Design a protein around this nucleic acid. Structure first.
Ligand SMILES: *OP(=O)(O)OP(=O)(O)OC[C@H]1O[C@@H](n2cnc3c(=O)[nH]c(N)nc32)[C@H](O)[C@@H]1O
Ligand SMILES: [Zn+2]
Ligand SMILES: [Zn+2]
Lengths: 852, 408
RNA sequence: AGUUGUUAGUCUGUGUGGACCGACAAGGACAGUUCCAAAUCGGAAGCUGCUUAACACAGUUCUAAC
């Protein structure tokens, strides 16, 4: 009696609750909520029809089976596998079959990427089919029953049906019951006939013992089956573990045109860089052929090598263990698997070339805008010592080292004169000592040529009428309010899906138009950067193969590299022009006809600009891809023509449904915050930033930036607490937690290791002072919207979000767990202090009127 | 050397891919610095063999090899530190602690790591773990002095009447890993049957065979994971079938201890196995034949539970290593704890069993449970619990029989 | 396999509905005198000194029985 049948019986002998839990012990499961919502709604893009997509992705990713050419799928069902396959490099034509009908799934027509080449056919049973010539085969047919014999027989029929299709081609076939002897023997005979191995997919629930026979792989069938069975047995109770979650798959949108996809690189422009890379690792430069790169040109590969929960916080925020989001934030992975997945679903696209009318419009607008932005300031080259300052005052440490070094500077000078000639030698960046010097040097060159954008605040609210550079969180609220006072329609804030991947060439040219203002010396360098490292970019990425990780070299022309200096400036600029155009269309100045014709007269548009541009600009807050716009009238909620044509598609809404605009400005999201208005005791009003606390809690329970160092993790916790006491004091839970933590760490452990990476965090809390005074300085003294400058004296006049409002933003008040916590934080602190040792311990609890 | 590393409240995992002078170069200098900084220090070693190697590499510095007396820095095996900690003598206060082979699997080793980490957290310690694979490692193909030519193939499980020539056709010495002595004997018989001088190694035979290995006569060497630690070969190829065995708990009703069958190895184990070759930049043919994917969830193994028992019973809630925390009940009262220490030390019972006995407060003499086991709780002698370790090999059975008889 | 829930109550919103309104507050939470809130009082209504409904329809309200 084989083990598999033992487990089959044992499972049969379970009850509703027992079986219900046992089917979900220690398995990965993909979040299908959002997908269920979108499909119930009736969306057509960005959504896996079923859970089949992730399941097949797990195989495809590890190259265990590689789709190619024509792909034939049997039992296509709703069609998750077919659609997932459509969006792959080699794939050319997909045909999916199923008997269809009652109790059986049906294909769900969609329009995710590659839909145009998918033919799904219901009403056709696979069993009676004339086996056709298949380059890649997929089969997912299986009907489980409590009777193992029935499943065995069904499996046998399946294998018989699917034998005549394997003609030296990549394949993946479901095997439902692999632990039946006759099944094992048939599999072995087929393996000898064809090869390939048998694998278990971690997604498949505990309730079944299915495996998959796949083309690319070897091993021993029997032992693997035994291993699976042993796992299941060990997992019957195993002090049941909750199932790990993963992020679902995306499938882009739109039709897929193969002939226009691949790219031809200006090999003369990047050849030196590619050659230098190849020379540097001249051992392992093995040109691959399993490279999954649709729109990025390829150059080769080479061998390469490869969160933690902060204890101090974890010990003091117990009640948040059951909270799904707090855990979910933690279980996110940046392994090569994750990075490859993200690159596949996000960056390997191609945005259609816009209509000529749009191109002319954008050209005009960009020229006008750049001329405006330079109404007073004028660009200048940056200087080395400035770069020294920026590094020193804050890879940081090594960066200081390298800047203080010497040979680095000579290297920079050499590459720089190369730039002056018009070629680039080490300007290459990675999508996360000698090579590291090259990288840092390229950053320095960009800083030298395009640093004036930031060092001089070209986009400050005063200068650009829309940008909010240099404000920080404690002022975005006031800016939003001042927007809300301007007359007009509702307020819209539409987030652009994957902004960086959505920068077409024309945008880059427009952004380059700024060179029409520099001085020849500067202009040469800036042209160098623009035309060599922005418009022709070369990137190193990591990919896992069934040998290890290897770096792959890719190149492209669009899609600004997110690590580059001057990214924020240019992003804000392009965003501004885009929103301006959208307002234009809203006010009717632009029509479809104007977009279509190759030469629309510029006079009308230029007139509108020079008359109303500054006024319209003052109706926006722009920061990177984040935008807040208040048009005069709600026709802006329909000006989707130009926006789509420029290729900046909104996120999570169908491509033509109108925007949805809030009216209360305390609801408009911006830089992942919303903003609330509070009344102090004196009646003085405050505007503070609020985000659903669960994110705050999770983000302060993640000890990234430290492997294992309690002295470090405590200081990170203290830093988080101080930031909480400075920018989130109005959340009760947060204030309590912050007071506890601050009283729960030595009173002289100066924190470090920045708590956030947003540009909008001036980091007033990284000091070692006493909070109350600094809070006064931040919000009372130096706040221009604070007419009455009477300082607060104790943490009692500091306001509080209204109870229902605090509950509505994720606070745990009113629940017994929090109550007991609230009561016994004193013991918790005592325990943590004990763990720490013998350093001093001040008590910040008496600051609340609950502990006096 | 970063001198700041010697601040208290500082534990650092350093590493050096095999050889590299991690012991041959760095460690004597580290001890030299600690002596100059006049720091009461401890050193922890995994096994007697590694202890002897460190002794050889520690020529000149005063080390209390657990000697003459009144040193400052001592050296001992990790499990020795564990047991000495368990015994109610106030453990000596060391300022600094160096620990080699930190990816070890002995429950005493895990508990030693936990205790050292907690002592650092107490703010009165400095810790240095010198190992090439931390908990949380997943890079099964890490650096090496020479690059390692990998290949996945069809590693045979038993003797083959014919085929698998790629195994024998090598021009270079082959080091092959096997999960049991019997399988080693079979494969060695086959290889010798092809006229290749072979050498089998095991837990017991290592003492007599290792020096023979140190001679240059042999060509094909089969071993279990004993060779996984400190066994210089200067070989050419490694055949690591990524099959292994381990003592794992199993609940399945009666929670017991079972010696697992063939099994894919942990990521770290396979890493060490691969790193048992390619330790010289002069060489090139660093071929590594793998035929498996390392295990996914080693959370079912038992040495974690036993190490938890050791740490909890240790005399602030005891807490494991942070990266190993992902795997306060087992603590027992005075008399029961003393009984547990006794049954571990005198009766030679593996940790889980001794803790189970001491939980129910049976003083060391009483052996009622050794026969009170149920019908199915028999052997091929009815102990209250089942642990295949107690009856796996004939020698193990003989020792367990001696214990159950009251002769031990 | 995938597809998957079903019935009861509770919890939201609406609608009908005379259908609630005040006064107070045990207790609770909260830690900003900040919000809830049983009881009790009074008011009104309805059928005669007792009641403050009733039901519906939708909640991604939850809870339990297939
Ligand atoms: O993963 P999936 O196959 O969709 O789970 P199923 O519910 O379809 O289970 C299929 C397989 O599992 C056994 N089974 C289903 N429901 C069960 C239950 O309530 N109690 C027991 N003991 N077994 C159960 C069934 O044998 C079927 O073949
Ligand atoms: Zn360059
Ligand atoms: Zn809020």
């Amino acid at each position: 009696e084989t083990l598999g049948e033992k487990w089959k019986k044992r499972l049969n002998q379970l009850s509703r609750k027992e079986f219900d839990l046992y089917k979900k012990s220690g398995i990965t499961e993909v979040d299908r909520t959002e997908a269920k919502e979108g499909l119930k709604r009736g969306e057509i893009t960005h959504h896996a029809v079923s859970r089949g997509s992730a399941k097949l992705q797990w195989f495809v990713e590890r190259n265990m089976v590689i789709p190619e050419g024509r792909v034939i799928d049997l039992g296509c069902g709703r069609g998750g596998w077919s659609y997932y396959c459509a969006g792959l490099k080699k794939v050319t034509e997909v045909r999916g079959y199923t008997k269809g009908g009652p109790g059986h799934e049906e294909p769900v027509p969609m329009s995710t990427y590659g839909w145009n080449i998918v033919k799904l056919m219901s009403g056709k049973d696979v069993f009676y089919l004339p086996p056709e010539k298949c380059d890649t085969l997929l089969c997912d047919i299986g009907e489980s029953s409590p009777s193992p014999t029935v499943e065995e027989s069904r499996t046998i029929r399946v294998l018989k049906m699917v034998e005549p299709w394997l003609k030296n081609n990549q394949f993946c076939i479901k095997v439902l019951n692999p632990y039946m002897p006759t099944v094992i023997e048939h599999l072995e005979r087929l393996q000898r006939k064809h090869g390939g191995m048998l694998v278990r997919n971690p997604l498949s629930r505990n309730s079944t013992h299915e495996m998959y026979w796949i083309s690319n792989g070897t091993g021993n069938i029997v032992s693997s089956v035994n291993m699976v069975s042993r796992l299941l047995l060990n997992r019957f109770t195993m002090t049941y573990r909750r199932p790990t979650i993963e992020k679902d798959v995306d499938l882009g949108a739109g039709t897929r045109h193969v002939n226009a996809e691949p790219e031809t690189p200006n090999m003369d422009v990047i050849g030196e860089r590619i050659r230098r890379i190849k020379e540097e690792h001249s051992s392992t430069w093995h040109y691959d052929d399993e490279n999954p790169y649709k729109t990025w040109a390829y150059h080769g590969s080479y061998e390469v090598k490869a969160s933690m929960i902060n204890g101090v916080v974890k010990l003091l925020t117990k009640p948040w263990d059951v909270v799904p989001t707090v855990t979910q934030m933690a279980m996110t992975d940046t392994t090569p698997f994750g990075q490859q997945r993200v690159f596949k679903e996000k960056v390997d696209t191609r945005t259609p070339k816009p209509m000529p009318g749009t191109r002319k419009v954008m050209e005009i607008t960009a020229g006008w805008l750049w001329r405006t932005l330079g109404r007073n300031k004028r660009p200048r080259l940056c200087t080395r010592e400035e770069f020294t300052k920026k590094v020193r005052t804050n890879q940081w440490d090594s960066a200081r080292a390298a800047v203080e070094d010497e040979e680095f500077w000579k290297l920079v000078d050499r590459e720089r004169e190369l730039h002056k000639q018009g070629k680039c030698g080490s300007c290459v960046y990675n999508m996360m000592r000698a090579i590291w010097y090259m990288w840092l040097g390229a950053r320095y060159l960009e800083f030298e040529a395009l640093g004036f954008l930031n060092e001089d605040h070209w986009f400050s609210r005063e200068n650009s009428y829309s940008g909010v550079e240099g404000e920080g969180l404690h002022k975005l609220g006031y800016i939003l309010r001042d927007i809300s006072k301007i007359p007009g329609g509702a307020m819209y804030a539409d987030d652009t899906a994957g902004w960086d991947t959505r920068i077409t060439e024309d945008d880059l040219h427009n952004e380059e138009k700024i060179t029409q203002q520099m001085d020849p010396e500067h202009r040469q360098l800036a042209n160098a950067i623009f035309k060599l490292t922005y418009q022709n970019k070369v990137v190193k990425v990591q990919r896992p193969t069934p040998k290890g990780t290897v770096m792959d070299i890719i190149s492209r022309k669009d899609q600004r590299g997110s690590g580059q200096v001057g990214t924020y400036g240019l992003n804000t600029f392009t965003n501004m022009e885009a929103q301006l155009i959208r307002q234009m269309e809203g006010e009717g100045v632009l029509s479809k006809t104007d977009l279509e014709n190759p030469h629309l007269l510029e006079k009308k548009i230029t007139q509108w600009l020079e008359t109303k541009g500054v006024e319209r600009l003052k109706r926006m807050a722009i920061s990177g891809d984040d935008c807040v716009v208040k048009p005069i009238d709600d026709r802006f909620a329909n000006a989707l023509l130009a926006l789509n044509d420029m290729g900046k598609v909104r996120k999570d809404i169908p491509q033509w449904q109108p925007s949805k605009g809030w009216h209360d400005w305390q609801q408009v999201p911006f830089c992942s915050h919303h903003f609330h208005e509070l009344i102090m005791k004196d009646g003085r009003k405050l505007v503070v930033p609020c985000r659903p606390q669960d994110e705050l809690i999770g983000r302060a329970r993640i000890s990234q930036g430290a492997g294992w160092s309690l002295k470090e993790t405590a200081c990170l916790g203290k830093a988080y607490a101080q930031m909480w006491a400075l920018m989130y004091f109005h959340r009760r839970d947060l204030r309590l937690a912050s007071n506890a933590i601050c009283s729960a760490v030595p009173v002289h452990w100066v924190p470090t290791s920045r708590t956030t990476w947003s540009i909008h965090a001036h980091h007033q809390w990284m000091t070692t002072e006493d909070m109350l005074t600094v809070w006064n300085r931040v919000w009372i003294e130096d706040n221009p919207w604070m007419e009455d400058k009477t300082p607060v004296t104790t943490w009692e006049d500091v306001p509080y979000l209204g109870k229902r409002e605090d509950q509505w933003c994720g606070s745990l008040i009113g629940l017994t767990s929090r109550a007991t916590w609230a009561q016994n934080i004193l013991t918790a602190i005592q325990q943590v202090r004990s763990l720490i040792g013998n350093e001093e311990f001040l008590d910040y609890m008496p600051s609340m009127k609950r502990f006096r | 050397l970063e001198e700041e590393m010697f601040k208290k409240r500082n534990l650092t995992i350093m590493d050096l891919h095999p050889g590299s002078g991690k012991t041959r170069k760095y460690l004597p200098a580290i001890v030299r610095e600690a002596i100059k900084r006049r720091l009461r220090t401890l050193i922890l070693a995994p096994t007697r063999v590694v202890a002897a190697e460190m002794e050889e590499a520690l020529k000149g510095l005063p080390i209390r090899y657990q000697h003459t007396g009144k040193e400052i820095v001592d050296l001992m095996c990790h499990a020795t530190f564990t047991m000495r900690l368990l015994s109610p003598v106030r453990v000596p206060n060391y300022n600094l602690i160096i620990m080699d082979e930190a990816h070890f699997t002995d429950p005493a080793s895990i508990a030693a790591r936990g205790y050292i980490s907690t002592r650092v957290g107490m703010g009165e310690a400095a810790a240095i773990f010198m190992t090439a694979t931390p908990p949380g490692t997943a890079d099964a193909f890490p650096q090496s002095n020479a690059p390692i030519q990998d290949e996945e193939r069809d590693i045979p499980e038993r003797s083959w009447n014919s085929g698998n020539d790629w195994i024998t056709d090598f021009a270079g010495k082959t080091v092959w890993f096997v999960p049991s002595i019997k399988a080693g004997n079979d494969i060695a018989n086959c290889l010798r049957k092809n006229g290749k001088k072979v050498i089998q190694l095991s837990r017991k035979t290592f003492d007599t065979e290792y020096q023979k290995t140190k001679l240059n006569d042999w060509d094909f060497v089969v071993t279990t994971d004993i060779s996984e630690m400190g066994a210089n070969f200067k070989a050419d190829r490694v055949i690591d079938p990524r099959r292994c065995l381990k003592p794992v708990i199993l609940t399945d009703g009666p929670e017991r201890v079972i010696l697992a069958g063939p099994m894919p190895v942990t990521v770290a184990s396979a890493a060490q196995r691969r790193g048992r070759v390619g330790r010289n930049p002069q060489k090139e043919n660093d071929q590594y034949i793998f035929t498996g994917q390392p295990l996914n969830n080693d959370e079912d193994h038992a040495h974690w539970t036993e190490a938890k028992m050791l740490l909890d019973n240790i005399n602030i809630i005891p807490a494991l290593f942070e990266p190993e925390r992902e795997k306060g009940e087992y603590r027992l009262k005075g008399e029961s704890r003393k009984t547990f220490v006794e049954l571990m030390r005198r009766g030679d019972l593996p940790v889980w069993l001794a803790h189970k006995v001491a939980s129910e407060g049976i003083k060391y003499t009483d052996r009622k449970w050794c026969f009170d086991g149920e019908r199915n709780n028999q052997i091929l002698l009815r102990p209250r619990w089942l642990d295949a370790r107690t009856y796996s090999d004939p020698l193990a059975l003989k020792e367990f029989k001696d214990f159950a008889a009251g002769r031990k």
